[PDB]
Structure formats: C-alpha cells, structure tokens
Write an enzyme that holds these catalytic residues in place. Structure first.
Site, PDB file in Angstrom:
ATOM      1  N   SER A  25     -11.230  -1.403   0.260  1.00  0.00           N
ATOM      2  CA  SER A  25      -9.980  -1.298   0.856  1.00  0.00           C
ATOM      3  C   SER A  25      -9.982  -1.659   2.380  1.00  0.00           C
ATOM      4  CB  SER A  25      -9.134   0.074   0.584  1.00  0.00           C
ATOM      5  OG  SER A  25      -9.080   0.266  -0.727  1.00  0.00           O
TER       6      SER A  25
ATOM      7  N   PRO B  38      -9.004 -15.492 -10.354  1.00  0.00           N
ATOM      8  CA  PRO B  38      -9.901 -16.347  -9.511  1.00  0.00           C
ATOM      9  C   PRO B  38      -8.903 -17.037  -8.237  1.00  0.00           C
ATOM     10  CG  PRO B  38      -9.866 -16.840 -11.770  1.00  0.00           C
ATOM     11  CD  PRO B  38      -8.669 -15.722 -11.587  1.00  0.00           C
TER      12      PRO B  38
ATOM     13  N   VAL C  91      -6.799 -15.672  -5.778  1.00  0.00           N
ATOM     14  CA  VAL C  91      -6.794 -14.963  -4.901  1.00  0.00           C
ATOM     15  C   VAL C  91      -8.161 -14.617  -3.993  1.00  0.00           C
ATOM     16  CG1 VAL C  91      -4.753 -13.993  -5.578  1.00  0.00           C
ATOM     17  CG2 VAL C  91      -6.722 -12.772  -5.835  1.00  0.00           C
TER      18      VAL C  91
ATOM     19  N   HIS D  85      -3.697   5.956   4.003  1.00  0.00           N
ATOM     20  CA  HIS D  85      -4.460   4.845   3.657  1.00  0.00           C
ATOM     21  C   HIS D  85      -3.866   3.439   4.033  1.00  0.00           C
ATOM     22  CE1 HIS D  85      -5.876   1.867   0.548  1.00  0.00           C
ATOM     23  NE2 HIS D  85      -7.108   2.408   0.555  1.00  0.00           N
TER      24      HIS D  85
ATOM     25  N   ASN E  58     -14.352  -0.344  -5.925  1.00  0.00           N
ATOM     26  CA  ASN E  58     -15.496   0.657  -5.214  1.00  0.00           C
ATOM     27  C   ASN E  58     -16.328   1.112  -6.449  1.00  0.00           C
ATOM     28  OD1 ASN E  58     -14.285   0.129  -2.740  1.00  0.00           O
ATOM     29  ND2 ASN E  58     -12.557   1.620  -2.960  1.00  0.00           N
TER      30      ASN E  58
ATOM     31  N   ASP F   7       0.738  -1.062   0.088  1.00  0.00           N
ATOM     32  CA  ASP F   7       0.058  -0.018  -0.003  1.00  0.00           C
ATOM     33  C   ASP F   7       0.685   1.205  -0.199  1.00  0.00           C
ATOM     34  OD1 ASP F   7      -2.270   1.889   1.003  1.00  0.00           O
ATOM     35  OD2 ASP F   7      -3.326  -0.053   1.092  1.00  0.00           O
TER      36      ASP F   7
END
Ligand SMILES: [Ca+2]
Ligand SMILES: [Cl-]
Ligand code: NA
Length: 279
Positions: free
Chosen positions: A224, A175, A177, A69, A161, A39
C-alpha cells in the site's frame, strides 16, 4: 530541485543507487495533474497538503479518514515533504470504512465514480488513481479496474502483502493496470510483498514515512506504501509530457532501474521505479 534529508523512498526513486538521502525532481512537480486516492479518505486539513487535497466522495456516513491509511498514501503521492509529486491535486474517495475494510461492490462503485468524476475536474496534464487495497480474486473487481484504466486514468494498484503470487488477488491480478510490489531501503524485496508474473514494477514499501491523521506523521510498511510512489511518479511524468495515462506503466517499467533488487523470485520482474531526473 533537490530536497535534502528526504524519506529514503523519495531519494531511492530519483537515484541509480541505494543509500542516498536527497530527492531530486523537476520543479513542475506534477502541477496540472490529478491523483485520486481511493481508500479510507484523506485528512485534507493536514498542513502538508497545502490546500491541494479534497474529499469528493464517500460511501459512509462520513468522508473523514478515521483510520490514517488513506492519509498516509495521499501523503506519499503529493504532500510537500513526504510526496513524490509536490504540486499535484489530490482527490479523496472513501471506499473503506475506518477499520480499513469495504465491500467489493462499494470499491467497484468508487472506481466507476472516478472514471466519470475526472470530467468534472481540471487535470490537463493527466489523471492517476492510486488503489492501496485488494482481496481475493474477483473478476468483477478486475473488470472495474480495467474500465477505469480504459477511460483514460493511469491505475496503480498494490500487489498485496501475503508473500504469495499476486495472480490470486484483485485488482492486483488485472493485466491492464500497474501492479506494484514493495522493496526496502537495502534494495531487497519486502518480506511481505506479493510477487508473480502479474507484477509490473516495484517501489519503496518498507518503513515509509508519511502523513497521518491528527496532523501527525508516521512510518508504516506495505505494498500500500509502494503503490503511491508509482502513482505519484506517473503524475510527475505525465506533467513533463513524457508519457500518457495509457502508456505510463509501460514507460515506468522501460525506464526503471533493472536488476538491482534481491530476493526476487524467478519469473517476477526486477524493476525499481526511477524518475530518470538529471539535474
Ligand atoms: Ca498488472
Ligand atoms: Cl459523497
Ligand atoms: Na499494504
């Protein structure tokens, strides 16, 4: 263990019902596991991390989280007050700049970094990666996330989002994960959450209180925020010996609260992460 007056999202994941305020969890609390937060970085000096957070990699002139974040996500994984897995080790990888953006090639590099770097760390109970990011579909980003998973890391990624089908976003659409959508405190799908057949699980995502930069706290919303609940849960369950990195996503879906969420489009799973703790 019982943490009274906890953030609603922690209470929700240890409850079969909405509207409670105590987080119940086994005291092991993810000890001996590791979560990589990929991140904007993590403010490791925040008192809430208690020395258990550290930056291990950046792709920019600094390793500091100038955004917040990354610090917020890490807090939901593992901070003492706001975190699911209160004794886990947090490793920060800064692939996003302080504006929250990053190029796909840097993000891929950070994922490959984590697959290697875990062999430098002591994580006997298992290794998790939390990816609260994504963009348009890219086969190479999906492949990077599938590699990280196949190397023995539980990969949790945000669905996005856009209130759209997550099949058109990466790495949400990979697919192999664990792709996480968001819900609110009334057990409704968050209005912004992506959906689709590629979603694996929902977690708390609206009005999530956690750590912020400058030693502060704040409440924000997004998939998130849902993702680190599931990442922290995976770390918690692996420490308990209940599941492995390879099967944790499936285990979480099998043990989830089922049918409880509203505003789930036809063809999306109605599954809410649940730690199945019985005091
Ligand atoms: Ca998936
Ligand atoms: Cl570095
Ligand atoms: Na988000």
């Amino acid at each position: 263990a019982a943490q009274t007056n906890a953030p609603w999202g922690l209470a929700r994941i240890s409850s079969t019902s909405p509207g409670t305020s105590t987080y119940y969890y086994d005291e092991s609390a993810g000890q001996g596991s590791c979560v990589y937060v990929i991140d904007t970085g993590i403010e490791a000096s925040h008192p809430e991390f208690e020395g258990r957070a550290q930056m291990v990699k950046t792709y920019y002139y600094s390793s500091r989280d100038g955004n917040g974040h990354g610090t917020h996500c890490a807090g939901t994984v593992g901070s003492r007050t706001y975190g699911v897995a209160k004794k886990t080790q947090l490793f920060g990888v800064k692939v996003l700049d302080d504006n929250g953006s990053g190029q796909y090639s840097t993000i891929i590099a950070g994922m490959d970094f984590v697959a290697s770097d875990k062999n430098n760390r002591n994580c006997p109970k298992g290794v998790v990666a939390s990816l609260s990011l994504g963009g348009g579909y890219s086969s190479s980003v999906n492949s990077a996330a599938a590699r990280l998973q196949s190397s023995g890391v539980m990969v949790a990624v945000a669905a996005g989002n856009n209130n759209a089908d997550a099949r058109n976003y990466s790495p949400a659409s990979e697919p192999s994960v664990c792709t996480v959508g968001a819900s609110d405190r009334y057990d409704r799908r968050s209005s912004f959450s992506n959906y689709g057949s590629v979603l694996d699980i929902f977690g708390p995502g609206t009005d999530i209180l956690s750590t912020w930069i400058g030693g502060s706290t704040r409440s924000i919303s997004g998939t998130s925020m849902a993702t680190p609940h599931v990442a922290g849960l995976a770390a918690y369950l692996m420490t308990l010996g209940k599941t492995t990195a390879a099967s944790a996503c499936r285990y979480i879906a099998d043990t989830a609260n089922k049918g409880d969420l509203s505003n789930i489009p036809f063809g999306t799973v109605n599954l809410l992460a649940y730690n199945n703790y019985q005091a």
